[PDB]
Amino acid sequence: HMETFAFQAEIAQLMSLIINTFYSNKEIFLRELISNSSDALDKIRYESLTDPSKLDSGKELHINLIPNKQDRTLTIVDTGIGMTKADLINNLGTIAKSGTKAFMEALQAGADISMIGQFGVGFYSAYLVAEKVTVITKHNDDEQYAWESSAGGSFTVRTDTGEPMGRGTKVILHLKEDQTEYLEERRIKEIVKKHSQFIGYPITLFVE
Ligand SMILES: Cc1cn(-c2ccc(C(N)=O)c(N[C@H]3CC[C@H](O)CC3)c2)c2c1C(=O)CC(C)(C)C2
Secondary structure: OOEEEEOOHHHHHHHHHHHHOOOOOHHHHHHHHHHHHHHHHHHHHHHHOOOHHHHOOOOOOOEEEEEEOOOOEEEEEEOOOOOOHHHHHHHHHHHHHHHHHHHHHHHHOOOOHHHHHHHOOHHHHHHHOEEEEEEEEEOOOOOOEEEEEOOOOEEEEEEOOOOOOOOEEEEEEEEOOOOHHHHOHHHHHHHHHHHOOOOOOOEEEOOO
16 A cells, blocks of 8 residues: 655755755745645646536635644645646656756855745755655546655655545645744744735635
């Protein structure tokens, strides 16, 4: 059921750089995950214009931010296009390889870690605040999957048995013990207003 895969040497190096470099502006992780959600939502909305049946799995196009203090998790949920098994194992890793190389060169040339999203590898900014990342996803053409990694050179992929999603992606951030500020209502609201205020989809900040 659960399969284990090795990250490509370039992506393992990217993850080590994110985890090891001293960089206090960690809050940019949220903008990067919301932008990936917005790109996924644009994609399913565009596709539905020529094929309305692509919305049979859900008409609603939104982003939900869910903090859970008992679990120490921050979940970013979207009803976007979702990802297939091939996206999780091969496709996105191929894109991430060229993106990492360009990001690495720019950093040596004086660029900042906040600029990560310009190189299409913004997802890995999750490791600035999370010790473990779980990705639950459902694409129209494939089954529901759970991707997972605590870095260290490997990731796992398995068919997900949890609550069926219909269509979209859930990025669950298992926060580091010193990164619990991102579970606070005031902190999340302040970050969304600062970096993600003009997203073209409704963003609901859930409370506890
Ligand atoms: C790199 C890259 C981008 N992403 C990503 C994340 C969320 C979403 C999301 N919330 O949906 C996303 N969406 C894309 C999927 C492909 C499509 O063509 C555009 C939108 C992409 C990921 C990567 C990786 O190397 C690891 C990973 C687990 C496959 C996730």
